[PDB]
Each structure stands twice: as C-alpha cells, then as structure tokens.
Amino acid sequence: LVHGGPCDKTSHPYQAALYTSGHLLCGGVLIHPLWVLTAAHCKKPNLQVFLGKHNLGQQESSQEQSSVVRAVIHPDYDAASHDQDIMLLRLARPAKLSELIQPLPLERDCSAQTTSCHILGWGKTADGDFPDTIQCAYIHLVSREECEHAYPGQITQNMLCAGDEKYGKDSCQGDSGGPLVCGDHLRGLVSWGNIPCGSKEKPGVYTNVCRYTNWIQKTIQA
Numbered sequence: 045l046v047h048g049g050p051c052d053k054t055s056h057p058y059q060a061a062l063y064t065s066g067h068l069l070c071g072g073v074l075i076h077p078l079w080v081l082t083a084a085h086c087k088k089p090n091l092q093v094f095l096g097k098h099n100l101g102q103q104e105s106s107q108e109q110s111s112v113v114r115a116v117i118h119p120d121y122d123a124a125s126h127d128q129d130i131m132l133l134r135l136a137r138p139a140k141l142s143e144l145i146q147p148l149p150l151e152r153d154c155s156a157q158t159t160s161c162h163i164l165g166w167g168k169t170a171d172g173d174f175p176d177t178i179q180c181a182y183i184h185l186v187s188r189e190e191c192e193h194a195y196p197g198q199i200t201q202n203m204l205c206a207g208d209e210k211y212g213k214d215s216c217q218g219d220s221g222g223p224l225v226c227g228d229h230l231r232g233l234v235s236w237g238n239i240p241c242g243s244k245e246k247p248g249v250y251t252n253v254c255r256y257t258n259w260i261q262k263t264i265q266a
C-alpha cells in the first residue's frame with residue numbers, strides 16, 4: 045500500500061495474511077469463522093492463512109494460523125482481464141474469534157451511497173520495500189465513467205474503482221485480495237491497477253463484492 049501509514053492495532057480484525065513457501069503472498073478478508081475471501085490470482089500451492097496479525101516480523105499472542113482445505117475460484121474468473129477476480133478459502137480450523145479476529149460483513153447493495161472507504165495491507169510501500177507493520181489509507185470510490193476513461197475497455201460491472209486525488213494513496217503488490225472497506229462493510233477486493241502504484245490519475249481496480257453475494261452464500265452453504 046503506497047503513501048499510507050501504519051493501521052491502528054484494533055482496527056483490522058478481519059485482515060488475513062496469505063503465505064506460500066514461507067513468504068507473504070496476498071491479503072484476504074475473514075468473512076465467516078471457516079472462510080477467507082481473497083483474489084483468484086492469489087491461488088498458490090499449500091496456502092497458509094494468518095489471522096490476528098499486525099506485525100508480520102514478530103510472533104503475536106493474537107495470531108492464529110490455518111492451512112486451507114478448500115480453494116474455490118469463481119467459475120467465470122479470467123486471468124488475462126482480471127475479470128471476476130475472487131476466491132474463497134475454507135480454513136482447516138474455524139477461526140477462534142477475539143478482539144483481534146472478527147469477520148467483516150459484506151456489502152450486499154450495489155447501489156450503496158457510501159464512499160467513506162479504506163484499504164489495508166502488507167503490500168509494497170512508496171520506498172519499494174515490504175512493510176512488517178500493516179499499512180492503511182482512506183480512499184474514495186471513483187465514478188464508473190472516470191474509471192472507464194482511465195482504463196479503456198478494461199472495466200467490467202464486476203469491478204469497482206477507488207483512489208485518492210490528493211496523494212495517490214493506493215493498494216500495491218502483496219495487498220491483493222485485501223479489503224476495500226466502505227461504511228464498515230466489505231465493498232471490494234484488491235485486484236489490479238496502475239504500475240507503478242499511485243491512484244491520482246489511474247485509480248486502483250477492486251473486485252465488486254456486492255456482485256458475488258449469491259455465489260458466496262451458495263459456496264459457504266454447499
């Protein structure tokens with residue numbers, strides 16, 4: 045996450061860190077004790093999910109680790125266009141909830157008026173390094189027309205754009221699958237955007253979670 049700052053320790057209990065071969069890969073969102081929501085392009089072998097983490101460089105009393113027993117990629121996911129970039133991960137062990145481990149409710153209404161949004165993650169910072177401490181930034185949803193002009197013919201109804209006109213606060217590599225939180229609900233998932241990272245002109249592109257509330261419910265209830 046570029047041009048942001050360290051999160052408040054108690055403000056991200058739904059944040060998951062996804063590992064493969066002992067390295068941070070992506071973010072994720074805890075949405076149910078047994079399920080983590082992430083981006084489909086984060087699919088790697090033997091995924092390890094860490095909940096209750098703030099600083100990845102230290103062991104923390106609140107952390108809970110789980111292997112993934114099931115990875116459910118959306119059936120219409122298209123790697124090339126990042127369309128329908130969503131995946132559900134079933135945890136081997138249901139998450140032990142605490143003040144630092146809690147699910148985040150999803151936004152079900154695609155017509156939600158809120159634009160008081162924030163992003164979070166352990167992705168690349170402005171200096172190019174990977175932070176040990178989780179980063180946070182407030183961003184705003186960008187109109188569909190403006191996003192369509194920024195990325196001609198790349199924006200589907202399954203994507204939502206967000207950014208910041210002032211400093212270009214944006215998500216980056218490693219933040220993928222992480223949450224775009226609007227009005228204390230999950231509104232989007234970090235999917236793709238401008239390289240180098242910066243949202244002043246080209247906003248970040250997020251999976252539009254409200255479009256998937258039926259598919260999520262059917263997967264969890266299967």
Ligand SMILES: N=C(N)c1ccc(NC(=O)c2ccccc2O)cc1
Nearest residue numbers: 215216217218220236237238241248
């Ligand atoms: N500007 C943005 N909002 C943005 C840019 C890039 C990524 N992700 C990547 O570049 C990436 C690259 C390799 C592997 C995984 C990734 O997520 C995520 C968000």
